[model samples]
Target: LTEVETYVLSIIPSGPLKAEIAQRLESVFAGKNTDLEALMEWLKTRPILSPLTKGILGFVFTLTRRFVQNALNDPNNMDRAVKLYKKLKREITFHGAKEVSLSYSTGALASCMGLIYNRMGTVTTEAAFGLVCATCEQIADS
Candidate 1:
């Protein structure tokens, strides 16, 4: 793992650690330290994980974020949401899948703004639409 990834994983929930925690899992499974060769061999046996891993990480991150947010807001809730986050990070890393990105196009942003305008008032709708167009132009320029 890269230094930045390692640092990030250290602070996230264990269940969301994704690829970083996979090495620790392999160590326990093999009763010894796992080398890159062995890890690659194991990964080859689970081809489906390659395609679905990103989605799984995203789901876990979203779930963890919601759980922590709600738990922190509720005074009566005694859940260790931070610990759960760490656990999930570890589990995700153990699965040998990481590097998830969340992205949306300018059109998606425009659609969201449209929905908001339809549900609410239109005072800001024009500005939002203008912003979306500007964003698209910026992306195209890039």
Candidate 2:
């Protein structure tokens, strides 16, 4: 499996919903025929990666792509890019490797993704993502 698939699957855990999402993501990544509407409908039924969270994920992913592209254009910004990438990878490793509850694990994954994007430059999305992950962790603990 690709790194993205592995990371997604790791956060999702074992379940019917995860299986379905994995299949759909695989289809999308493979350049195969896909029905986005159907995939979205299926996503609506899943609790871990819900529609709202998916939207945020998409937005953050886009923002990260843009930020990376912009950062690459400036020679002076290379250090910033490297630092942010390192920090993000560190956080992902720290959180993802921990033995946490499913919700906490998912939240940490989301938060790490958000942190990567934010560290790259989008403060608002990063803050929102942090809040979301924090809330998820809190709920899971409670």
Candidate 3:
């Protein structure tokens, strides 16, 4: 397996979604990638790598994501955060998040990420996750 595949697969645990994305990736890369050795160096970069793109979301989104991720690690508050996020998702999507203070939103952000992690076995992209979290936080605040 290539480094990207190995890295990606490492995050995917065994079961139903077992290697689903990984295998898909392999099939996608099969015809394009010829030299197996250079596979390690064939690095893929996200839009964030650009300084301009980074500058766009550099401050607010990045800081909020970090804050939320930190909150998820908090043993005392993690569960409550997830519960709140689930509730918030129900309300915001279909529609508690209204009563949620900004201080509490950090944990709520973690809940969103927590749900994704639980389902996917790993985070696919922080940019997307953080964007949703930040948007949700604003909607919750409003």
Candidate 4:
């Protein structure tokens, strides 16, 4: 598997959802029959490689949605999600992904604050996850 795949697996842990997402990642690169041996090198010319890398960013967005959904499920889950995001922030920093790390960390913290202040139920929390994901995408571009 690719480094991106490895990193994704390491962060997400093993489960049915992880398996499903991993399987979906296969489709993201399907039929791209390019001989680009070093994908990151090819991606370096772009400012934010994730977005320019096409389906990779889409994969991340979907992944983020899952995490957001889990986090907003309950107060305890929100705490766990905060821990996961903190861990991700550190890992991204270690990987030298300064901008992406900063963007995501800020977005996640702001979104989580919505949950902390107001203990909404399932329906409203579902609505909140959309806002959280949307916040991440918007900030990630900046």
Q: Per-candidate TM vs. native?
A: 0.19, 0.37, 0.29, 0.27
Give the alpha carbon lDDT tens digit for every residue of 10-95 in model 3: 43345644344444456545654354323212221222132222222222122223322333345545666555555444443211
Per-residue error for 52 in candidate 4, Å, reads 20
Q: Per-residue CA lDDT of candidate 4, range 23-109, in tens?
A: 544544463423333332332332422332222333233332232333333455456446544443343222343233344443344
Off by over 4 Å in 4: 32-142
User: What is each predicted model's overall lDDT from 0 to 1?
Assistant: 0.31, 0.43, 0.37, 0.38
| Preferred candidate (TM-score higher): 1 or 4 | 4
Stretches of model 1 off by over 4 angstroms after superposition? 1-31, 52-142
- Candidate whose TM-score is highest: 2
- Compare candidates 2 and 3 on lDDT and give the better one: 2
**Candidate 1's TM-score:** 0.19
Q: Which pairs of residues collide in candidate 2?
A: none
Which pairs of residues have clashing backbones in candidate 4? none
Task: Give the winner by lDDT: 3 or 4.
Answer: 4
Q: Which of the two candidates, 1 or 4, achieves a greater lDDT against the reference?
A: 4
Candidate 2's C-alpha runs over 4 A off are 48-142
Please give the clash total of every predicted structure, in order.
Answer: 23, 0, 1, 0
lDDT of 2 by residue, 8-117 (tens): 45545467966776676666657573555555454444566644345433432343233222221322334443444344344433334222213333334444444444
Q: Once model 3 is optimally superposed onto the true structure by TM-score, how far is the C-alpha of residue 77 displaced, in angstroms?
A: 2.3
